[PDB]
Design a protein around this ligand. Structure first.
Ligand SMILES: Cc1cc2nc3c(=O)[nH]c(=O)nc-3n(C[C@H](O)[C@H](O)[C@H](O)COP(=O)(O)OP(=O)(O)OC[C@H]3O[C@@H](n4cnc5c(N)ncnc54)[C@H](O)[C@@H]3O)c2cc1C
Ligand SMILES: NC(=O)c1ccc[n+]([C@@H]2O[C@@H](COP(=O)([O-])OP(=O)(O)OC[C@H]3O[C@@H](n4cnc5c(N)ncnc54)[C@H](OP(=O)(O)O)[C@@H]3O)[C@@H](O)[C@H]2O)c1
Ligand SMILES: [Zn+2]
Length: 306
C-alpha cells in the first residue's frame, strides 16, 4: 500500500507475524497431469496471508521474506549460536493494495523445491514448509525486500513486456492487475506477457491471465511450453527467449518507445538468453554486459532470476 517502497521494516530480530488465510494447489496433484514420474513433481501453491497494510506497506515488484521454523542442521554442526534457518525470499504476487484494493492480504506463488529415478532425493526446507501451511497457521515474515524491480510511479506511455518462467510469473500477476484495473497511474502502453513452463498444466493462474487478455486488448498473452513445443529457429525446446525473437516488433517498440523489460523466474541467469535475443533485435553489437547495463541504466531493463 501507499506508494514509495520501504525495505527491511522487519528483520529476523523483529519479524512480522501473519496468519494464513488460504493455501491452494494450482497444479495437478502428483501422478495426475503431464509430467511423468522420471521427471519428478511440479507442485505449485498459491498462498494468501492476512496482514496489516499499515505495518507492512509493500509495493508490487518487491519480495517478502519467510523464516522457516526450526534449527538449520548445517548451522548446528558448524555450531553458530544463530542456528535458526536463514531467510528465504518470495516474489509478492498480489497487487500493492491487494486484489480489489481491500488492503487485507498479501500473496505468494511458491513451488516445492525438491531434487529427485523420479523419486525424491532432497527436500527444500522453506518451500515445503510454506506449501504445507494450513489456514490459521502463523508465518514469520521479513521485509519488504528490494526496490529496483518496480513499476513506473508516474503516468506511463511506453509498452511493457513481462518475461516469466515458472514461479517467475508471480510479480506479473499483481503488476497486471494494478496496471489494468487499479490504475494508480495512467498507463497508455501495451502489455505483452511472455510466460514459460515445462507443461501446459504447469502454467498457473491461466484462467485469470487469459481473462485479462480477452478483456483488454491492452494486454497480450504468449506462452512457451518447453517440453511440448519446439521453436521454429533451431528446433530445440520452446523457451520464452524464442518467443521474444518472434515478437521482434513489440520488442522494437519497447526499445525505441521508452518501454520496459521485466524478466523474472528461473533458473539462475536465465535472463542472459532473453537479453541477448533482445540485443539481436536492436542490432547493437556491444558486449552482452554493455548492452545489459545500458538498458538497466536507461530504466528499460529489470531482472530478478533465481
Ligand atoms: C528474489 C527471489 C525471489 C524468489 N521468488 C520465488 C517465488 O516467487 N516462488 C518460489 O517458489 N521461489 C522463489 N524464490 C526461491 C526461494 O527463495 C527459495 O530459494 C526456494 O523456494 C527454495 O527454498 P528452500 O528452503 O525450500 O530450498 P533449500 O532448503 O534452501 O534447498 C535448496 C535446494 O537444494 C536442494 N538440497 C537440499 N539438500 C541438498 C543436498 N544435501 N545435496 C544437494 N541438494 C540439496 C533442495 O532440494 C533444494 O532444491 C525466490 C528467490 C529469490 C532470491
Ligand atoms: N531440477 C533442475 O535442475 C531444473 C530443471 C529445469 C529448470 N529449472 C527449474 O526452474 C525452477 C522452477 O521450477 P518450476 O516447476 O516452477 O517451472 P520451471 O522448471 O522453472 O520452468 C520454467 C521454464 O524455463 C525454461 N528454461 C530452462 N533454462 C532456460 C534459459 N537459459 N533461458 C530461457 N528459458 C529457460 C524451462 O525449460 P525446461 O523444460 O528445459 O526445464 C521451463 O520450461 C526450479 O524449481 C527448477 O526446477 C531447474
Ligand atoms: Zn479491466
Amino acid at each position: 500500500p501507499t506508494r514509495e517502497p520501504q525495505i527491511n521494516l522487519f528483520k529476523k530480530s523483529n519479524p512480522y507475524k501473519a496468519k494464513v488465510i488460504s493455501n491452494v494447489l494450482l497444479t495437478p496433484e502428483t501422478g495426475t497431469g503431464k509430467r511423468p514420474k522420471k521427471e519428478g513433481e511440479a507442485l505449485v501453491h498459491r498462498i494468501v496471508l492476512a496482514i496489516d497494510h499499515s505495518a507492512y506497506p509493500y509495493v508490487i515488484g518487491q519480495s517478502g521474506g519467510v523464516i522457516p521454523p526450526g534449527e538449520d542442521p548445517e548451522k548446528k554442526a558448524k555450531g553458530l549460536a544463530d542456528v535458526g534457518y536463514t531467510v528465504r525470499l518470495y516474489s509478492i504476487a498480489s497487487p500493492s493494495y491487494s486484489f480489489g484494493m481491500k488492503e487485507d492480504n498479501i500473496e505468494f506463488i511458491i513451488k516445492r523445491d525438491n531434487i529427485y529415478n523420479g523419486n525424491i532425493q532432497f527436500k527444500g526446507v522453506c518451500s515445503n514448509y510454506m506449501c504445507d501451511l494450513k489456514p490459521g497457521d502463523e508465518v514469520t515474515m521479513t521485509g519488504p525486500s528490494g526496490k529496483k524491480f518496480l513499476l513506473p510511479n508516474t503516468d506511463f506511455s511506453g509498452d511493457i513486456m513481462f518475461l516469466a518462467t515458472g514461479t517467475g510469473i508471480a510479480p506479473f500477476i499483481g503488476m497486471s492487475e494494478e496496471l489494468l484495473e487499479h490504475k494508480l497511474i495512467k498507463f497508455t502502453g501495451n502489455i505483452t506477457l511472455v510466460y514459460g513452463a515445462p507443461y501446459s498444466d504447469e502454467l498457473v493462474m491461466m484462467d485469470y491471465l487469459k481473462g485479462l487478455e480477452s478483456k483488454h486488448k491492452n494486454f497480450k498473452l504468449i506462452t512457451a511450453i518447453s517440453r511440448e513445443e519446439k521453436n521454429s529457429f533451431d528446433g530445440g525446446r520452446m523457451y520464452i527467449s524464442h518467443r521474444v525473437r518472434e515478437q521482434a516488433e513489440a520488442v522494437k517498440k519497447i526499445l525505441n518507445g521508452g518501454g520496459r523489460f521485466y524478466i523474472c523466474g528461473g533458473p539462475k541467469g536465465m535472463e542472459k538468453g532473453v537479453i541477448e535475443e533482445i540485443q539481436k533485435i536492436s542490432g547493437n553489437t556491444g558486449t552482452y554486459e554493455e548492452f545489459k547495463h545500458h538498458l538497466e541504466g536507461a530504466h528499460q531493463l529489470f531482472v530478478e532470476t533465481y
